[PDB]
Structure 1
Amino acid sequence: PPEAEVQIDRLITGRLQSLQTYVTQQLIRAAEIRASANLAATKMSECVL
C-alpha cells in the first residue's frame, strides 16, 4: 500500500490531465460549431424563408 500509493498518484494526476485536455478541446470546438449553427439558422431565415 504505501509504495503503491505513490505510483498510483502519479498515474491519477496524469490521467486527470488527459481528461481535462479533452474537455477543453471539446469546448473550444463546440464554440466553433455554435457559430456555424448560428450562421445556418440565419441563412434559413433569410435565404429560405
Structure 2
Amino acid sequence: SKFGAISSVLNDIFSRLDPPEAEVQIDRLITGRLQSLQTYVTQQLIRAA
C-alpha cells in the first residue's frame, strides 16, 4: 500500500525523486508502516488477554 504516495517500493522513491522531496513520501510510508505494526501489536495484546 502506498498510503497516498507515489509508489509502494522504497528503492523507486530513493532513486526517483529529489534527495529532499522523497523525504515526504518516505515519511508518508513510514507513518503507515509504523501504524500497521502498532495496530498488530495492539490486537495481539488484546488476543493475549
Give me the TM-score of the superposition, normalised by structure 1: 0.61
RMSD of aligned residue pairs (Cα, Å):
0.4
Name stretches of at least 5 consecutive residues in structure 1 with no aligned partner: 32-49
> Could you say which structure has the larger radius of gyration?
1
Which residue does the alignment assign to 2:30? 12
Q: Which has the higher contact order (CA 8 A, sep 6+)?
A: 2
Once superposed, which parts of structure 1, at least 4 consecutive aligned residues long, lie more than 3 Å away? Answer: none
Once the two structures are TM-superposed, the CA of residue 6 in structure 1 deviates from its matched residue by 0.6
Q: Which runs of 5+ in 2 are unaligned?
A: 1-18
Q: Percent of aligned pairs with the same residue?
A: 100
Query: Where do 1:1-49 residues align within 5 Å?
Result: 1-31=19-49
Displacement of 1:4 in angstroms is 0.6
Q: CA deviation at 1:20?
A: 0.2
